[PDB]
Amino acid sequence: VHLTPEEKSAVTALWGKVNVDEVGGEALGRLLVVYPWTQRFFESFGDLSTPDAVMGNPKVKAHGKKVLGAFSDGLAHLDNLKGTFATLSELHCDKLHVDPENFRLLGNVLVCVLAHHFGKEFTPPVQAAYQKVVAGVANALAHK
Amino acid sequence: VHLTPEEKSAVTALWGKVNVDEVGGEALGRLLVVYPWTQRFFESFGDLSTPDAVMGNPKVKAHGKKVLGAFSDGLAHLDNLKGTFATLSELHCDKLHVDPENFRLLGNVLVCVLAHHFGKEFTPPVQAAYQKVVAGVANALAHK
Amino acid sequence: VLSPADKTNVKAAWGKVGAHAGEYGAEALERMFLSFPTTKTYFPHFDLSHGSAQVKGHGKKVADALTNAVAHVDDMPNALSALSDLHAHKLRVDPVNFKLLSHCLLVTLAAHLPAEFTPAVHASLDKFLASVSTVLTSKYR
Amino acid sequence: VLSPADKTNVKAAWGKVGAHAGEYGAEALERMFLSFPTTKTYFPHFDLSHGSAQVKGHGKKVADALTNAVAHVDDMPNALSALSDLHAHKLRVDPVNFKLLSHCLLVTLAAHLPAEFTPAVHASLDKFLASVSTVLTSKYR
Ligand code: HEM
Ligand code: HEM
Ligand code: HEM
Ligand code: HEM
Ligand SMILES: */[SH]=c1/[nH]nc([C@@H]2COc3ccccc3O2)[nH]1
Ligand SMILES: */[SH]=c1/[nH]nc([C@@H]2COc3ccccc3O2)[nH]1
Ligand SMILES: */[SH]=c1\[nH]nc([C@@H]2COc3ccccc3O2)[nH]1
Ligand SMILES: */[SH]=c1\[nH]nc([C@@H]2COc3ccccc3O2)[nH]1
Ligand SMILES: S=c1[nH]nc([C@@H]2COc3ccccc3O2)[nH]1
Ligand SMILES: S=c1[nH]nc([C@@H]2COc3ccccc3O2)[nH]1
Ligand SMILES: S=c1[nH]nc([C@@H]2COc3ccccc3O2)[nH]1
Ligand SMILES: S=c1[nH]nc([C@@H]2COc3ccccc3O2)[nH]1
C-alpha cells in the first residue's frame, strides 16, 4: 500500500494517540457483537451471549491487543504487508479458514472505533487514509 | 496463483476446447444481463434493453473476445498475474473506476458459461481449479 | 423482485430438473466444498468425499427447501422462517457463504440444463437464489 | 429482523442527532466520496469539494429518506418503493455501494454521538442500514 505523505501524516498523527490496551479489544468485541457469525471462531473465549458480556470479556480484550499489535506492525511496513502478514495469513486462511470478507469487516469496525474515540478529529480525509490502510491489511492477510 | 499439476491439467484440457470467438461475448453479455448495474459502463455499446438485444449485440461479442483474450494471457502467466494485468488494472481501477467486486462477478459468470458449454465435463474438481484462476485474475486487476 | 417473468423461468427450470433435484443439490454442495474450502468448516462431522451418503442426503434436504421456497414464492419469508433461525442463530452461517452456494447451485444447473439455461433463465434463477439467501440471512438484520 | 430492541436503539440515536441529521448526511457522503472514489462516478455533475452546496443539499435528501424509513420501519419496502426504482433501475447503483455509504453513515454518527454509539446501538444501526440497503437493492431481485 502506498499512501501519499498527507495520508501517512493523517494516519500516524492519530495512531500515536491510540490507547493500545483498549482499542484492539473494542474493535474485536464490536465485531463479535455486530457480526455474530464471527463468534463461531471464538467458542473458547467464554460468555459472548450479550454485548456487555462480550465487551467485558477478559479474553476478547486480551486478544484484541494482539490484533491491534498486528495493525501497528503493518503500519510500519506498509510496503511489505505481504511479507509482514505471511504467517498470520497461513493461520487465518489455512488453519482457521476464515472467509477474507471478515478481515474487511474487522478493518471497518476498527475505523468506527477510531471515529468514536477521536470524534471531529477523525475527519473525512483522515478516514480516507485509514480505509486505504485496512484494505491493504485485509488484502495481505488474504493472500494465502 | 499456484495451481497443483492436477488443477492445471483440469484447466488447460478444457481451455483448449473453448470457442475463443463466442465464450467471451457470452460471458460479458450474461454479466450485463444478470447484473444490470454493469451496463452503466457500456452506454456506448448500443441497445442493451433485453437479453436478446444484449446477447446479439455486435459490440458485446466483439468486446468479449478481448476479455477472453485477457484470461488466456493470464492462464499463461499465472505466476505473474500482477505484472500481466498491470495496465488493465490502471484502466479499470483508475480510469473507469469499476468496483473490484465486479471482476469477481465476471469471473463467476465465466465459470457458469464454461459449465453450460461443457456440461458433465466441467466436473466439481474442474470447477474448483477454475475458481482459483478467476479469483487470482480478479485479484490482479484489483491491485490498482 | 420476483416478477411474473422470473417465476415462469424458475418454474420452467424446476420442471426440467425434475426428480434429479436432490442429486443436483448434492452435486452443488460438493462443488461448493471443493471450490470454497472455507465452507467445509460448517460440516466437520460430515464425510465430504465423493459418493458420500451424508452429502447425498443433505443435497436432498437443500433441494427440498428450495422447492418449498418456489412453491410458496410469494411468501418465502414465512416459508423459510425456521431455516433462517437455524442458519443465522444456531449455525451462525456467514452471509457470504450463501453467495457461494448460490453460485454452485447455478453452475450445477448450467451443467445439466443446456437448453434451459438461457441468459434470461440464468438471471431469473440468480434473483430467485438471491431472494432465498436474503431470507436466510434476514435474522442477522 | 428489526426487533423492538433495535427500533428503540435507532430511535434513540435519531433523537440525539436531531436537527443535525442533514449535515451529518452531507458529511457521510463526503466521507464516502473521499474514502471510496469509485462512488464519485455516480455524481459526475456534482461538485464534490468541501462546503459544496450540492453535497449539502443531497445530504439532507439522504437524511430525510432515512428518517422516513425509521418513521415507517414496519413497512420500509412500501415507504422506500420509489427510491428503490430510482437507485436500481435508473441510476443502476452497484449493490456494493450501499455497504460503503452505510459504513460512512455509521462512522459519521460514531464521530458525533460519543455517548450513544455503544456496541449495542452500533449493532442496531448496522441492521437498520442493512435493511434500508436491502430494500434499495430489492429491485435487482
Ligand atoms: C483483519 C484483521 C485481523 C488481524 C490483523 C488479526 C490478527 C490476529 C493475530 C495477531 C492473531 C494471534 C496470532 C498468534 O497468536 O500467534 C490472531 C488470532 C486469531 N484470529 Fe485474527 N486477525 C484478524 C482477523 C480475524 C477475523 C475476522 C477472524 C475470524 C472471525 C479471526 C479469528 C482469529 C482466531 C480464532 C484466532 C486465534 C488463533 C488461535 O489462537 O488458535 N481473525 N489474529
Ligand atoms: C475480471 C475480468 C475483466 C477482464 C479480464 C477485463 C478485460 C478487459 C480488456 C482486455 C479491455 C480492453 C482494453 C483495451 O481496449 O486496451 C477491457 C475494457 C473495458 N472493460 Fe473490462 N475486463 C474485466 C472486467 C470488467 C468489468 C466487470 C467492467 C465493468 C462492468 C469492465 C468494463 C470495461 C470497459 C467499459 C472497458 C472499455 C474501455 C474503453 O474502451 O474505454 N471490465 N476489459
Ligand atoms: C440456498 C441456501 C441454503 C438452503 C436452501 C439450505 C437448506 C438447509 C436445509 C433444508 C437444512 C436442513 C435442516 C434440517 O435438517 O432441519 C440445512 C442445514 C445446514 N446448512 Fe444449509 N442451506 C442453505 C445454505 C447453507 C450454507 C451457505 C451453509 C454454510 C456454508 C449451510 C450450512 C448448513 C449446515 C452446517 C447445516 C446443518 C448440517 C447438520 O449438522 O446436519 N447451509 N440447510
Ligand atoms: C442509505 C442508502 C441511500 C439513501 C437513503 C439514498 C437516498 C437518496 C435520495 C432521497 C435521493 C434523492 C431522490 C430525489 O431527489 O428524487 C437519492 C438520489 C441519488 N442517489 Fe442515493 N441513496 C442511497 C444510496 C446511494 C448510493 C450508495 C449511491 C451511489 C454510490 C447513490 C447515488 C445516488 C444518485 C447518483 C442520486 C441522484 C443524484 C442526482 O442526480 O441528483 N445513492 N438518493
Ligand atoms: S461503522 C461499521 N461497522 N461495520 C462496518 C462494515 C464492515 O463490513 C464492510 C464490508 C465492505 C465495505 C464496508 C464495510 O463496513 N462499518
Ligand atoms: S452461475 C453465476 N452467475 N453469477 C454468479 C456470481 C458472481 O458473483 C459472485 C461474487 C462472489 C461469490 C460468488 C459469485 O457468483 N454465478
Ligand atoms: S484467508 C484467504 N485468502 N484466500 C482465501 C481463499 C482460498 O480458496 C479460494 C477458492 C476460490 C475462490 C477464492 C478463494 O480464496 N482464504
Ligand atoms: S479496481 C480497484 N482496486 N482497488 C480499488 C479501490 C481503490 O480505492 C479504495 C479505497 C478504500 C478501500 C478499497 C479501495 O480499493 N479499485
Ligand atoms: S455485489 C452483488 N450483487 N448480487 C450479488 C450476488 C452475490 O454473488 C452471487 C452468487 C450466486 C448468484 C448470484 C450472486 O450475485 N453480489
Ligand atoms: S446481512 C447480509 N449481508 N449479506 C447478506 C446476504 C447474503 O447472501 C446474498 C446472496 C445474493 C444477494 C445478496 C445477498 O446478501 N445478508
Ligand atoms: S458479509 C456481510 N454481512 N453484513 C454485511 C454488510 C456489508 O458492509 C456493511 C457496511 C455498513 C454497515 C454494515 C455492513 O455489513 N456484509
Ligand atoms: S441483490 C444484492 N446484492 N447485495 C445487495 C445488498 C446491498 O447492500 C447491503 C448492505 C448490508 C447488508 C446486505 C446488503 O445486500 N443486494
UniProtKB/Swiss-Prot annotation, chains A, B:
Q: What is the effect of changing Y35F?
A: In Philly; O(2) affinity up; unstable
BP GO terms, sorted = blood vessel diameter maintenance; carbon dioxide transport; cellular oxidant detoxification; hydrogen peroxide catabolic process; inflammatory response; nitric oxide transport; oxygen transport; platelet aggregation
The entry's stated outcome for C93R is: In Okazaki; O(2) affinity up; unstable
Q: Which residues carry this modification: N-pyruvate 2-iminyl-valine?
A: V1
UniProt effect for mutating V60A: In Collingwood; unstable
What Gene Ontology cellular component terms go with this record? Answer: blood microparticle; cytosol; endocytic vesicle lumen; extracellular exosome; extracellular region; extracellular space; ficolin-1-rich granule lumen; haptoglobin-hemoglobin complex
Coiled coil stretches, renumbered: none
Question: Which consequence is recorded for altering V18M?
Answer: In Baden; slightly unstable
Keyword entries, A-Z? Acetylation, Congenital dyserythropoietic anemia, Disease variant, Glycation, Glycoprotein, Heme, Hereditary hemolytic anemia, Hypotensive agent, Iron, Metal-binding, Oxygen transport, Phosphoprotein, Pyruvate, S-nitrosylation, Transport, Vasoactive
Q: According to the record, which residues are glycosylated? A: V1, K8, K17, K66, K120, K144
Effect recorded for L75P: In Atlanta; unstable
Provide the effect of C112F. In Canterbury
The impact of changing H143Q is: In Little Rock; O(2) affinity up
- What results from changing D73V? In Mobile; O(2) affinity down
Q: What is the effect of changing S89R?
A: In Vanderbilt; O(2) affinity up
Effect on the protein of changing P36S: In North Chicago; O(2) affinity up
Sequence positions bearing Phosphoserine: S9, S44
Q: Which InterPro entries match?
A: Globin, Globin-like_sf, Globin/Proto, Hemoglobin_b, Hemoglobin_oxygen_transport
For this protein, what is any one GO molecular function term? oxygen binding
Outcome (variant: P124Q): In Ty Gard; O(2) affinity up
PROSITE patterns the UniProt entry points to: GLOBIN (PS01033)
Which residues are annotated with the PTM Phosphothreonine? T12, T50, T87
Q: Where is this site: (Microbial infection) Cleavage?
A: 7-8, 25-26, 29-30, 35-38, 45-46, 52-53, 56-57, 71-72, 74-75, 84-85, 92-93, 104-105, 110-111, 119-120, 122-123, 128-129, 140-141
Misc: One molecule of 2,3-bisphosphoglycerate can bind to two beta chains per hemoglobin tetramer.
**Name the record gives this protein:** Hemoglobin subunit beta
What organism is recorded for this protein? Homo sapiens
Curated annotation (Swiss-Prot), chains C, D:
Q: What is the effect of changing H20Q?
A: In Le Lamentin
Q: What is the effect of changing K11E?
A: In Anantharaj
Result of altering R141L: In Legnano; O(2) affinity up
What would changing H103R do, according to UniProt? Answer: In Contaldo; unstable
Give the recorded effect for A115D: In J-Tongariki
PTM description = The initiator Met is not cleaved in variant Thionville and is acetylated.
Q: Which SUPFAM superfamilies match?
A: Globin-like
Q: According to the UniProt record, what happens if one changes D85Y?
A: In Atago; O(2) affinity up
What is its quaternary makeup? Heterotetramer of two alpha chains and two beta chains in adult hemoglobin A (HbA); two alpha chains and two delta chains in adult hemoglobin A2 (HbA2); two alpha chains and two epsilon chains in early embryonic hemoglobin Gower-2; two alpha chains and two gamma chains in fetal hemoglobin F (HbF).
What is this protein's record name? Hemoglobin subunit alpha
The record's account of tissue expression is:
Red blood cells.
Name the reported effect of E27G.
Answer: In Fort Worth
Give the lineage.
Eukaryota, Metazoa, Chordata, Craniata, Vertebrata
- Per UniProt, which keywords does this protein have? Acetylation, Disease variant, Glycation, Glycoprotein, Heme, Hereditary hemolytic anemia, Iron, Metal-binding, Oxygen transport, Phosphoprotein, Transport
Q: What is the effect of changing T41S?
A: In Miyano; O(2) affinity up
